[PDB]
Amino acid sequence: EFEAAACKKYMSKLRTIVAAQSRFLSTLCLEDIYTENTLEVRTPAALGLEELFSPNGHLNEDADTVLVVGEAGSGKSTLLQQVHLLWATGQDFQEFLFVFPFSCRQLQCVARPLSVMTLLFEHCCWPDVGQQDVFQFLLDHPDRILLTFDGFDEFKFKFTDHERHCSPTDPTSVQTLLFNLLQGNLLKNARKVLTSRPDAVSAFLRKYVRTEFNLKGFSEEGIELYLRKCHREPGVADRLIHLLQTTSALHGLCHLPVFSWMVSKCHQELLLQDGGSPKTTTDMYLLILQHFLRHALGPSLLQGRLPTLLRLGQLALWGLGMCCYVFSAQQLQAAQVDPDDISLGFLVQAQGVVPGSTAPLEFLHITFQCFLAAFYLVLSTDVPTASLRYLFNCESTVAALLQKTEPHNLQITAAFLAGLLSREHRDLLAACQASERSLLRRRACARWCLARSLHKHFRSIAMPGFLWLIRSLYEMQEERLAQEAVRGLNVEHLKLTFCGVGPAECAALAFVLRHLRRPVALQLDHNSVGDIGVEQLLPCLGACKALYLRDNNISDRGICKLIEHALHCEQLQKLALFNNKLTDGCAHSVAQLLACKQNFLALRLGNNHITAEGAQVLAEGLRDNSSLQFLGFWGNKVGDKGAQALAEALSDHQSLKWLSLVGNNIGSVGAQALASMLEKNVALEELCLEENHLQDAGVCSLAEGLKRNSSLKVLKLSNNCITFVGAEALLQALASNDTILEVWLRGNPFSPEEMEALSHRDSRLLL
Amino acid sequence: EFEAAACKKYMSKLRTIVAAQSRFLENLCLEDIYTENTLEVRTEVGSPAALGLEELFSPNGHLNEDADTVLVVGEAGSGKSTLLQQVHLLWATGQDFQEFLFVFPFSCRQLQCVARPLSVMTLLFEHCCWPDVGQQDVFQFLLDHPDRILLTFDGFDEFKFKFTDHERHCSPTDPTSVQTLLFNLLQGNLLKNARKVLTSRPDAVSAFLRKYVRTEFNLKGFSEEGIELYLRKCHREPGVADRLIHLLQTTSALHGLCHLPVFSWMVSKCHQELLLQDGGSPKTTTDMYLLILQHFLRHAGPSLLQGRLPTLLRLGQLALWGLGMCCYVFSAQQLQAAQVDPDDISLGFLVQAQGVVPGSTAPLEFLHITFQCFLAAFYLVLSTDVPTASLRYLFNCESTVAALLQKTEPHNLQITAAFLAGLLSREHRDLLAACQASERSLLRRRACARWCLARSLHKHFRSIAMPGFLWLIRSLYEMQEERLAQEAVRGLNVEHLKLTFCGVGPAECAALAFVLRHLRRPVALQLDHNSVGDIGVEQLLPCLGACKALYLRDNNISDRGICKLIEHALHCEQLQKLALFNNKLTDGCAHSVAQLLACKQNFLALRLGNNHITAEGAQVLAEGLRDNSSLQFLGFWGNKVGDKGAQALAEALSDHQSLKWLSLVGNNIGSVGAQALASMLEKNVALEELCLEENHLQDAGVCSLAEGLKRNSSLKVLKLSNNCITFVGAEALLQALASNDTILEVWLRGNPFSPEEMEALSHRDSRLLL
Ligand SMILES: Nc1ncnc2c1ncn2[C@@H]1O[C@H](COP(=O)(O)OP(=O)(O)O)[C@@H](O)[C@H]1O
Ligand SMILES: Nc1ncnc2c1ncn2[C@@H]1O[C@H](COP(=O)(O)OP(=O)(O)O)[C@@H](O)[C@H]1O
C-alpha cells in the first residue's frame, strides 16, 4: 500500500533522472543523432540494438550477464546511453522496472566500503520516500532489475577482492561487490550489461558471460546517415560525403564513430580543402585541437594557450599512471587547472547518473586524455627524454607513471607521441619548445626505439601489441624508418585474425609491410577490412604471396579493385574470400584474374552469393588458366547450370587438384556434366560434393565417368539422399579403380544392415 | 409431356429457393444495399479494361459458350461472395442471365466437408435442390442440355486437391470424390459446355486451374464514389451518412481502408463509436478489427476484453485448428468438441452458412474468413497453450501449434501474421495487458516477432515473389514500430521497385510509405497498373522524399491527386521523374504542373499521355515550361492539345536549354501547329526527338516543317507516321534533308503513298523510314 506508492514514486524518479542524463551528448539531441552501429554476436551473426537481450529471437533471462566489447571510440558509452533513454522514455526494454546506470571509473574512485543498498541508493538514485520498503521490493524482484556498468576495463581488481559475500546490506569493497553480482550471489537473475575495451576482457570474467557482443563501428552506409543527421544546412552533408569518397584514408578513419564526430565538428575547416586532408589519427586530433583553440594564427595559435595545454596534459598523464580517469574539485586545484583551462573544452562534466550535485570532471573522451598526455610528454621541460623509452619498452616520476599506466592506454599514447614527432607535426609544434633542438632530441629517442621495436617483438615468442607498433611507425610518417624496422625480419606468415583490423589499421600495415623483402602470407581473417580497407592495403599487395580475407564484409567493388592491382603483382598467388558479400557482379574480374595471371594458385570463394549466372562467366577465364590448383565454392549456389559450365572448362584443365562445390544445390544434371569431366580430366585429385540433391541417379552417372578416370583420389558425397542402389553402382565401379583413396557417404539414408554390407564390400567407404 | 412438366416444376423450385437464399445478407435487403464494385477483365494488351456486373459472360459485346470457365479473383473482403449472390438473385428473379435454365450455387468450403463420395446427380439434387417430381427425367434433360446450366463455386481456394483426385471420370451417376468431380467438370468430361463461375483469392491454385480458364476477371473493390453510396444506402437516419462521409474525407488512412467493402461494412457497423471520437481514429487494419471486437463485446476497455477472455480464447482455438486443417465450416459435433458453449456463439463471431435457415442444427462458420484469421492471431498472442517457436512459423525463420501453422494455407497464414504483428504493437499491447498470464507475457512474444520481421525483407530478396513482399511490408506497418521499419530496410540496396499488377490500393500505400521512407539510397518506385487513386497518393506522401522517380500509370488518379502530389514534390530534392500515363487528369491540374516546371529546378521527366488535357491547359503549363531549364523528356501521347496548344508549347521550347524528347502523338494537330513547331526548330538547339504521329498535319504542314528544318542542326529523329502526307510533302521534306547532316531517322509509315512513289522515296534517301 504505502509500500506500493513508495516504489511507484521511485520508479518515476529513476526514470525522470535517467532520461534527463541520457537525452543529450557530452559531445544536439540523442534521439536525432544516434546512427546505428554494426553490432555482432559471437557464434558471427549481425543484429540490431533492440535485440540486446534477445539476440536469437527470445527474451532469455538465462544469460543474465551480457558483454559488449569494442575499440576506444567504437560507440559503447553512446550505445548504453540510447538503451537507458529507450527505457526511461518507456519505448523499449520495458521488461525492467528499474535500470541502474553506473560508470565504473566513478565507482573505482569511491573510498569507503559499500553495500548493495548504498550502491543503488547513494551512488545512483536515492528514494525520496520509503527507502527500506523500496529496497525490499528490489530484493524480492531482482529479475526486474537491469544494471549497466560502462567501461568495465577501468576497474582494478585484486585477489583480496575475489571473495564470497552474500548480504545485500553488509558493506564491502566495490570490487568484491560486483564479483558477487556476477556470481549470482547478489540480486540473482538481475540483468547486467558490461561494456569494455578488447584487452581487458578476462579468463575468469568470460567465465560468467552468457552472451558476448562486438561493436565494430559505423558501416560505409552508416557514416553517410550520421553526416546527413548532423548537417541539415542545404547540401553541406553532400559535400562532406563527396569529400570522404575522394579521400580514402580519412573515409576509412570515419568507420570509428569518434572520428565521424570529429569530421562533422571540423567540416568547415575541411571543406576549405587547403592543403591536403588529414590521413593519420594524430592528424585528426591536431585538427580538433585547433578547432577548439580557434573558438576560445597556426603554430602561433598553439603557442597562445601552451600553458593551459601543458597543465591539462600533466593532469592527463598523472591520470593515466594512477588509473584515474575522473577528477574531483580538490584534485583539479592540486593539478592547478584554472577555469580558463576548463573552458577550453577538453574537460567536461562527468556524465553519470549519481545523486544531486556535484559531479567530478573527466576528459572529453579517454583518447583525448591519451593525446594530451602525449602532448605534455613531447613539450614539457619537466619530462626527461630518457623516460620516453617506457612508451616502447627499450627511475623518475614520469617513468614511474608510464610503468603503472594500463597497456591499452599506453599504446594509444605511444602512437600519438610518434605522430607528434612526425616531420610536419614537429614544424607545427616548433613555436612551443624552450630549446630550438628540443623536439629533435625527443625524436632521436623515439625513432631509435621504433627502429628496433618489431625485431624486439618477434624475438620474444602477442599480435595485438604488434599492430600498435605498426600504427606508431605509420603515425610518425617516416618512410626510411618503416624500411629500417622490417630490415632483416624474415617473416613468412603473418596471423592477424580477430585483431579488430579496420581501414585505418590497413593504411598502417600497407605503409610498413610494403618494405618487406621476402613476400608474405598475410592473414586478416575475421576482421572488418571492408572495401575501404582493401583500397588502403593496395600499396603492400606486391609484397604478398597470399592474401586471406575471410569474414571481412568485402563486396564486388572491393574485389574488383583488388584484382585490378593484383594483375600487376607477380608475388601474389593465393586469395581467400570466404564469407563476404560477393555476387555475380565480380565474375568478370575473377575471369580476368584466371585468364591473364599465369602465376595464380588458389582461390577460395565460398559463402558468398555467386549463382549459376556468374559461374558461367568465370568458367570462361578458367579454360584459359593453366596454373590454378585449389578452387572453392562451399556454400554458394552455382547449381546444375553452373556446375556444368565449370565441369566443361576443367576437363581440359592441366593443374587443378582440389575443387569444392559443397552446398551448391546441385542435382543429377550437374552430376552428369561432372561425370564427363572425370573421364577426360587427368589432374583433379579431390572433389567435394556434399550437401546437395545428387540422388541415386546422380551417383550412377558419376560412377560411370569414374570407370574411365584414374587421377581422382577423394570423392566426398555426404548428405545427397543416396540409397543402397546408388551406393552399389558406385562400389562396382570402384572394384576396378586402383587410384581412389577415400569416398564419403556419411549422413545418407541406409539401413544399418545396408551399412554392414557396404563397409565389407569396399574398405574405403566412410560411415 | 410429363418430362417437360417435371422440368418446369423443377425450374420453379430452383428459382424460388435460389431467390430466397440470395435476397438477404435480417434487417438488410440485398437489392437495397448492393453498391457496384470495380470489375476488370484481364487482357494481354495489359491495361485491363473495366465493365459492369451484367457483362460477366459477355465482356466484349457478345455471349460465348467458348469460355465455359470464368474466374473472378479478388482480395479477401473484395466482395466476391456478394457479387455471386447478386448474380444468383438477378437470375432467380428473371432479371438477367436468362440464357441459363438452371443455376446451381455451391459453397466450396461446405462441399469440402462432405464425407461420402458423390455423383453429378447427387451433387445437384442432394447438395443443391431435390426435384419434387420426375427426378430421373429432369436429370436426363440436364445431361441433354448442359449448355443451359450455370454452376457457381464460391471460394474455390478452400478446396484441397490431390494427385489421387486428378483422374478421369466420365459417368454422371457413378459416385466419386468431390474433387475429381470438379476436375472432370472443368475438363469438359461432365456437362460439356455448361458455364462455371469460380471465385478465388489471388494466390490460390492457379496452374492447372488457369490452364482451364478462358476468361479472368479482377474484383478491385469500391471506388471513392462507391463508398459514399454504400454509406448513404446503409444510413437513412437524418444526416448520419453525411457525418461519416465527412469523417472519412478528414481521416485519410481510414477512408483508404474503406475501398475494400469489408472495411466499409465495419465502419458502418461502428459508426456510433467512431462518431463519438475522443480517442484517435483507427488507421491500421488491426485497429479496425479491434474496434469491431469491442463493438461486439459492448452488446453482449481492456477490462472489457478481459471480461470475455475465456470465450475469445475458445473461439481463437477453434479458428486456429480450422486454419491448420483447412476447415472453415463447423458441425454441431465439432463445436461441442472445441467446447464452445452458446454464450460463445451468441457473442456473434460465428454465423450460419449462407443458404441455411436460422437455428436449425446447421453447421457454422466465422463471420468472415478474416475474422477466423484475426481470432487465430488473438489466441496465438494470449493463450498459455501457445509457444513462441510457433510464432516463428508465421514468418518463416515441434508442437501441435507449429504443426497446424505448417499446414495452414499461405494466404491465410499471411493475414494471420499481419494481425499477430498488429496485436503486438505498442498501443495494442497496452489494450491486451489485462489478458496475459504473466506481466511480461506479451513482451516475450514481441521479442520473437520483432526479431523475425527485422530479417524478413533481407530473407526475401536473398531468394530471387512481389505479392509476398507486399505482405511483409504490411506486417511491419501493422506493428507500428518505426525503429523496426528502419532495421528491416537497413542495408537493402534497392534501386528499382517493381510493384505492377500487385493489387496496390491506399491501405497498401500507407504501409509502403511507413517502410520505404527509411530507405537510404533513393528509389525508382513503380506502381503502374494498380488502383492507387487520389487517396493512395495522400498515403504515399511520407516516402516521396525517398523516391528518385515515381511511376503511376493506369492508377485512376485525378487532378486532386496530382496537385496534392506536386505540393509535396516541390520539397523533395531526390524526386526527378513522374509518369502519369492513363489517368483522369484534366486542364484543372495545369496550374500545379506549371509550378513544378517553374520552381523545381532539377526535374527531368514528365509523361502525361492518355489523360484529358486540351488546348486550354497546354497554354497554362507552357508558362512554367519557359522558366524551366532542366526538363529532358515530356510526353502528351493521346491528349488533345491541338493547334493552339501545340503553338504555346513550341513558343516556350524554342528558348529551352535542356529538352531532348517531346511526344505530341494523337493530339489532333494541323498545319497551324506545324508552322509554330517549325519556328521552334530554327531556334531550338537542344531538342533531339519529336514524335508527331497520328495527326492531320497534311502536305501543307510537312512543308513549313521542312522549312524550319533547314535552319535546324540539333534534331535527330522526326516521326511523322499517319498524317495524310502525299508524295509532294514527302519531296519538300527530302530536298531539305539533302542539306541536313544531323538527322538520323524520319518516319513516314502508314501514309497515303502509292507503291511506286514509295520505292522512289525509299531509294532517294536512306533516312526516310516507310
Ligand atoms: N551510435 C552512435 N551514433 C552517433 N554517434 C556516435 C555513436 N556512437 C558513438 N558516437 C560518437 O562517438 C563519440 C564517442 O563514442 P563513445 O560511445 O564514447 O565510444 P566509447 O565509449 O566506446 O569509446 C560520441 O561522443 C558520439 O558523438
Ligand atoms: N458489392 C457490394 N455491395 C455492398 N456490400 C458489399 C459488396 N461486396 C461486399 N460487401 C460487404 O462486405 C462483406 C464481405 O464481402 P464478401 O463478398 O464476403 O468478400 P469476399 O467473399 O470477396 O471475401 C459483405 O458481407 C458485405 O457486407
mmCIF file of C-alpha atoms and ligand atoms in Angstrom, chain B residues 33-35 37 75-82 222 230 261-262 265 368, ligand 2:
data_model
loop_
_atom_site.group_PDB
_atom_site.id
_atom_site.type_symbol
_atom_site.label_atom_id
_atom_site.label_comp_id
_atom_site.label_asym_id
_atom_site.label_seq_id
_atom_site.Cartn_x
_atom_site.Cartn_y
_atom_site.Cartn_z
ATOM 1 C CA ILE B 33 -27.526 -2.496 -50.311
ATOM 2 C CA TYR B 34 -25.544 -3.845 -53.284
ATOM 3 C CA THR B 35 -23.254 -0.993 -54.244
ATOM 4 C CA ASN B 37 -17.854 -2.898 -57.470
ATOM 5 C CA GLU B 75 -8.532 -9.981 -52.197
ATOM 6 C CA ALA B 76 -10.289 -11.190 -49.025
ATOM 7 C CA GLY B 77 -13.284 -8.928 -48.444
ATOM 8 C CA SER B 78 -13.186 -7.514 -52.007
ATOM 9 C CA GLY B 79 -16.839 -8.590 -52.433
ATOM 10 C CA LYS B 80 -16.733 -11.891 -54.385
ATOM 11 C CA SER B 81 -19.297 -13.855 -52.327
ATOM 12 C CA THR B 82 -21.620 -10.832 -52.530
ATOM 13 C CA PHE B 222 -15.374 0.196 -54.047
ATOM 14 C CA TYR B 230 -22.867 2.398 -49.632
ATOM 15 C CA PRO B 261 -16.074 -3.390 -48.970
ATOM 16 C CA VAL B 262 -15.483 -5.438 -45.777
ATOM 17 C CA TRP B 265 -19.159 -2.576 -43.674
ATOM 18 C CA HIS B 368 -15.802 -13.787 -42.481
HETATM 19 N N1 LIG C 2 -20.996 -5.145 -53.897
HETATM 20 C C1 LIG C 2 -21.213 -4.953 -52.574
HETATM 21 N N2 LIG C 2 -22.171 -4.105 -52.123
HETATM 22 C C2 LIG C 2 -22.399 -3.907 -50.803
HETATM 23 N N3 LIG C 2 -21.694 -4.530 -49.835
HETATM 24 C C3 LIG C 2 -20.704 -5.404 -50.146
HETATM 25 C C4 LIG C 2 -20.403 -5.671 -51.562
HETATM 26 N N4 LIG C 2 -19.399 -6.558 -51.582
HETATM 27 C C5 LIG C 2 -19.081 -6.844 -50.292
HETATM 28 N N5 LIG C 2 -19.858 -6.149 -49.438
HETATM 29 C C6 LIG C 2 -19.815 -6.185 -47.958
HETATM 30 O O1 LIG C 2 -18.577 -6.734 -47.494
HETATM 31 C C7 LIG C 2 -18.801 -8.006 -46.882
HETATM 32 C C8 LIG C 2 -17.738 -9.007 -47.313
HETATM 33 O O2 LIG C 2 -17.893 -9.334 -48.689
HETATM 34 P P1 LIG C 2 -17.568 -10.782 -49.309
HETATM 35 O O3 LIG C 2 -18.309 -10.853 -50.622
HETATM 36 O O4 LIG C 2 -17.750 -11.863 -48.268
HETATM 37 O O5 LIG C 2 -15.997 -10.709 -49.628
HETATM 38 P P2 LIG C 2 -15.220 -11.981 -50.236
HETATM 39 O O6 LIG C 2 -16.252 -13.066 -50.429
HETATM 40 O O7 LIG C 2 -14.659 -11.452 -51.534
HETATM 41 O O8 LIG C 2 -14.171 -12.292 -49.196
HETATM 42 C C9 LIG C 2 -20.221 -8.417 -47.243
HETATM 43 O O9 LIG C 2 -20.823 -9.215 -46.219
HETATM 44 C C10 LIG C 2 -20.922 -7.093 -47.452
HETATM 45 O O10 LIG C 2 -21.458 -6.566 -46.235
#
